[PDB]
């Protein structure tokens, strides 16, 4: 599709295609005077200008180290004969905001980050970009900006956090999230609870397991938009700083080849990213982010594309949440390149795709050490953890425009039960606390948590933990138009579309309606007749929006459905 | 008005009204684990958390020093017994982008900055904010965020740049903008031109005269949202770092009083800001930014309010662009507090308004040194530069919803001439180059440069300089639905509403239509009959938008008219 967003270069083989707009014409003397004031010499004006976009801030572990990484990227850009100009956008902490109304601001931060980087690159006429995200929503935001601008770019992942260790126990952020419920159930004492909180996050880096950040870092490496090993080198590893110092050398080569994001992000490399998500058991959130990335380069990517790749790619990796190990253990067995080399050898990946190294994926992977002999993290193709991928698309009566579930295969094939409907997370949690037994056998519906109804499509962790804490994990099902962070050991479906705020069938369910989930048929159905459902829709009125001003009201005005990746600029 | 945007504090006299949402409940153990990982002790969890939002980036003189200022703010916050968490948003350089399509991204950056700070403060549950903007659009963006959140906040202006000096000549960014035209006219040699560019911007700080940055810094100080002297201390002055180190002490007192932005930004303090703009000859851009600030706190502010204050307040200050001196000279004669003390003594200002010092404006100004004896920058009330303010609101046939002009009083009372219409800056400049004499006596209309048509309401400097370079300054008039950066010595009107993209009368003007500007009647009229104008409107079709994706398409979808301050969140 013909994306029209950002300025075109003035009208070659020059390396400063964009910055020449302001450094060369005498009519841009004001621009050149500012550039002299910031320290550029006349000779520096002849060089390419690289925008170095970090997402540093001090109040989150995933982002507090990124200013140090940005300094290393700048040094490397200068060492490559170019001008490096650092800038920095916002981000938010999913781990801090989880459980609170601040989570309404998280998903849209991806789109704000994309707008932020697009704005600076366009106004300042930078020739290329190196982005340094370190947290969940940051990663896709930086790629989406690169796709809109279509200027040479590289994403340097800030790296994963290391697990915490204390007194021969290991902890991560998920240990800290689970601490409260374990204390309420009497599984741990208050003092043991406090010990978890002091040792779960030991330093810088993104949350430690195969959750959204590590899913997206790995997928973006598989897509060719990060250098080999970026996704698997830990945040505090000296090799991460070395990658930062090399990004300028690689970007220089991309400027010489004019190898741009829309030359790298293609239908085949989007498929390669999706293959990595299925093989590694990555997060359902990658559906939203990979759709948004595809749209940013003018391509199409639908829920059905995800179902087809899921069916074609087995789940192979024993990594948390589903499994035992964490990202740092992948690092020790050869890293993301070793994993992708195996998937390429199995024929699951397209090796001809160009990448930010200036060569193809197959050329990158030809030389990397293979998975360490004897490793038990990546299963052989003949003994997979699941025959197909975890990610499942469900439609049917109640999700006619789609929905997304993580299906391990241990939940069974079907669930049927009467609906128990809540207009938000708070009322569901109050009910399961006051009367957990009323939840046994039900299909729990938490609605009004979609892109517009939330607002902001918040991710919710407490409902699954509350259900497991009450002993109900395999005894009820959970449905939302929002997102769920965890599994329950039972059926858990998010992203239901249309959302309740938009008058989708989820907004018409009544307590007691019999809902049946059929994984084989890929349907979430209701025993209520289509005619009675249409009767309810004729009487339905959309509730008032929860905001009338500020960034979230703009989001309500702009956001597309979850099946459309919640893009905001169409 | 009942603004609903951001989270409410959990339900006092505590100083951590918001951060207690995440530091106190056992159910927020994940939040506390992240906070330990970023370095907070158990005792630190009891403290207020201050979001310190800077707009640092390396590629603009107005912003390159702001990371150093942010470190000083953090030290002062810690010295005041609180936790300081730095974060940083984007900005763009009007001086670099001027003359290019990158300028389409400038005005909307104000609204992106507001969204950015709102997002972080909300997701992270910070109790208060100290913002450090240093450039044009940054300032109102930070205040708009503070107004939405209504949490205690202080804006620390990054400070003005100093004029450049070389070989007994003085230069500023405007010298550099004018260099090309002077070279084309043969007024200066190419070597003299190059010398201007090397000496116009000597260090850090916002553009040096009473242009938008210094207008807004002064207005925001007059509004009570910056500490005394913030607007007049130069960026490179040691006293600016001292102000940074004191902001935490003042913010602590605001948390103790719960003195919030909506307690400080009121109809009376908005009027005080407007008084400072009129007395100092500040930029027409302040109309857009002060309207947006008023809306952010749920207040009303219209073009007619600006006309009433302009009529009530004389233009008193001999400052560039209109005058001789620059901001650093105001600093030497007692600074912005001395100016405001004089305006308060004259009865032009409401002294009872509360400010970020925890006291009223009158209490702040009681002790400040008055304007230095013998100073000739601020005229006495009995000998003003202009009896009323420079800012004039014009309506009439062609701007029925309003427009904004800077009127010195030396242009005369009326202009009439045939219309010469251009669909953008490029075609106007091509025409004045190829045939300057065809412009003599005309009313030049540059349309399609509005919020949606530009897109982005770009500010245009070249048309006025081209008109003066051709010797036509007092021989034609200039009208736009966009914005003009400079004066021409003749009639120059911007912000014409409705804009051409919206089918306003400006979009129906044809070459040769007789247009009359009447300053006394405050009207821009056409000799074309209302019936023929309505005939043209019935045949008019809106042109296609110039973008279909990215941040500027979102802006097109969200932005209100210039008469409504180009707000995006309503
Ligand atoms: S909060 Fe950053 S990846 Fe979890
Ligand atoms: S570009 Fe920053 S105030 Fe002029
Ligand atoms: Mg996510
Ligand atoms: Mg402005």
Topology at a glance:
Two copies of one chain form a homodimer.
Chain A: H1 20-23, H2 29-37, E1 49-54, H3 66-79, E2 83-88, H4 94-97, H5 106-124, E3 128-132, H6 138-149, E4 153-155, E5 164-166, E6 169-171, H7 173-184, H8 190-199, H9 212-222, H10 238-257, H11 261-264, H12 267-280, H13 285-296, H14 303-312, H15 327-332, H16 335-345, H17 361-366, E7 391-393, E8 404-406, E9 414-422, H18 425-434, E10 443-446, E11 459-460, H19 462-469, E12 477-480, E13 483-484, E14 492-494, E15 514-518, E16 523-526, H20 530-538, H21 550-558
Parallel strand pairs in A: 1-2, 1-3, 3-4, 9-10, 10-12, 11-13, 12-14
Antiparallel strand pairs in A: 5-6, 7-8, 8-14, 9-15, 15-16
Helix pairs in contact in A: 3-10, 5-6, 6-13, 7-8, 9-12, 18-19
Bound molecules: FE2/S2 (inorganic) cluster (FES) (2 copies) and magnesium ion (2 copies).
Task: Characterise the protein shown here.
The first copy, chain A, is an alpha/beta fold. Chain A has three domains: 49-162 and 203-355, Rossmann fold (3-Layer(aba) Sandwich); 164-199, no CATH class; 393-564, IlvD/EDD C-terminal domain-like (Glucose Oxidase, domain 1). Chain A is 38% helix and 11% strand. Chain A has helices at 20-23, 29-37, 66-79, 94-97, 106-124, 138-149, 173-184, 190-199, 212-222, 238-257, 261-264, 267-280, 285-296, 303-312, 327-332, 335-345, 361-366, 425-434, 462-469, 530-538, 550-558, and strands spanning 49-54, 83-88, 128-132, 153-155, 164-166, 169-171, 391-393, 404-406, 414-422, 443-446, 459-460, 477-480, 483-484, 492-494, 514-518, 523-526. Chain A has an eight-stranded mixed beta sheet with strand order 7-8-14-12-10-9-15-16. In chain A, β15 (514-518) and β16 form a beta hairpin. In chain A, α3 packs across α10 and α9 packs across α12 (267-280). The first copy, chain A, is globular and about 75 Å long. At the A-B interface, α2, β2, α4, α5 and α7 of A face α2, β2, α4, α5 and α7 of B. The site of one FE2/S2 (inorganic) cluster has 9 residues of chain A, from α4. One magnesium ion is lined by residues 136-137, 212, 285 of chain A. Chains A, B: Its EC number is 4.2.1.9. Chains A, B: This is Dihydroxy-acid dehydratase, chloroplastic. Chains A, B: Belongs to the IlvD/Edd family. Chains A, B: It is found in: Plastid, Chloroplast. Chains A, B: InterPro entries: DHAD_IlvD/Edd, Dihydro-acid_dehy_C, DihydroxyA_deHydtase, DiOHA_6PGluconate_deHydtase_CS, ILV_EDD_C, ILV_EDD_N, IlvD/EDD_N.
């Amino acid at each position: 599709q013909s994306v029209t967003a950002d300025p075109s270069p003035p009208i070659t083989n020059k390396l400063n295609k964009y910055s020449s707009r302001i450094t060369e014409p005498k009519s841009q003397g004001g621009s050149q005077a500012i550039l002299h004031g910031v320290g550029l010499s006349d000779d520096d004006l002849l060089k390419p200008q690289i925008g170095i976009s970090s997402v540093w801030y001090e109040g989150n572990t995933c982002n507090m180290h990124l200013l140090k990484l940005s300094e290393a990227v700048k040094e490397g850009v200068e060492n490559a004969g170019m001008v490096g100009f650092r800038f920095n956008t916002i981000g938010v902490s999913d781990a801090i905001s989880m459980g609170t109304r601040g989570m309404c601001f998280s998903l849209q931060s991806r789109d704000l980050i994309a707008d932020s980087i697009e704005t600076v690159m366009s106004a300042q006429w930078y020739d290329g970009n190196i982005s340094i995200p370190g947290c969940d929503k940051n990663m896709p935001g930086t790629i989406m900006a690169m796709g809109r601008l279509n200027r040479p770019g590289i994403m340097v992942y800030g790296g994963t956090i290391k697990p915490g260790h204390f007194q021969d126990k290991t902890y991560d952020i998920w240990s800290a999230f689970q601490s409260y419920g374990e204390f309420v159930s009497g599984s741990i004492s208050d003092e043991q609870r406090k010990t978890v909180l002091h040792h779960s996050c030991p330093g810088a880096g993104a949350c430690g397991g195969m959750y959204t950040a590590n899913t997206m870092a790995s997928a973006i490496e598989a897509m060719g938009m990060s250098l080999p090993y970026s996704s698997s080198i830990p945040a505090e590893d000296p090799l991460k700083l070395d990658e930062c110092r090399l990004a300028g050398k690689y970007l220089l080569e991309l400027l010489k080849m004019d190898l741009k994001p829309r030359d790298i992000i293609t239908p085949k490399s989007l498929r390669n990213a999706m293959v990595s998500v299925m093989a590694l058991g990555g997060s359902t959130n990658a559906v939203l982010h990979l759709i948004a990335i595809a749209r940013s380069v003018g391509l199409e990517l639908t829920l059905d594309d995800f179902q087809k790749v899921s069916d074609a790619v087995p789940f192979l990796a024993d990594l948390k949440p589903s499994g035992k190990y964490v990202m740092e253990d992948i690092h020790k067995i050869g890293g993301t390149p070793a994993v992708l080399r195996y998937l390429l050898e199995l024929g699951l990946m397209d090796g001809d795709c160009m990448t930010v190294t200036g060569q193809t994926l197959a050329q990158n992977l030809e030389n990397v050490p293979s998975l360490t002999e004897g490793q038990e993290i990546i299963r052989p193709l003949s003994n997979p953890i699941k025959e197909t991928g975890h990610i499942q698309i469900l439609r049917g009566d109640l999700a006619p425009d789609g929905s997304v579930a993580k299906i391990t295969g241990k939940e069974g094939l079907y669930f049927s039960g009467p609906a128990l409907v809540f207009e938000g997370e708070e009322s569901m949690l109050a009910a399961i606390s006051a009367d957990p037994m009323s939840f046994k056998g039900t299909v729990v519906v938490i609605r009004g948590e979609g892109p517009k109804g939330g607002p902001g499509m918040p991710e919710m962790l407490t409902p699954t933990s509350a259900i497991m804490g009450a002993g109900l994990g395999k005894e009820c099902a959970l449905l939302t138009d929002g997102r769920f962070s965890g599994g329950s050991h039972g059926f858990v479906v998010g992203h239901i579309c249309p959302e309740a705020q938009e008058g989708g069938p989820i907004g018409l369910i009544k307590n007691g309606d019999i809902i049946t989930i059929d994984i084989g048929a890929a349907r979430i159905d209701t025993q209520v007749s289509p005619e009675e459902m249409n009767d309810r829709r004729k009487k339905w009125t959309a509730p008032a929006y929860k905001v009338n001003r500020g960034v979230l009201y703009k989001y309500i005005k702009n956001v597309q459905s979850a099946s459309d990746g919640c893009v905001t600029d169409e």
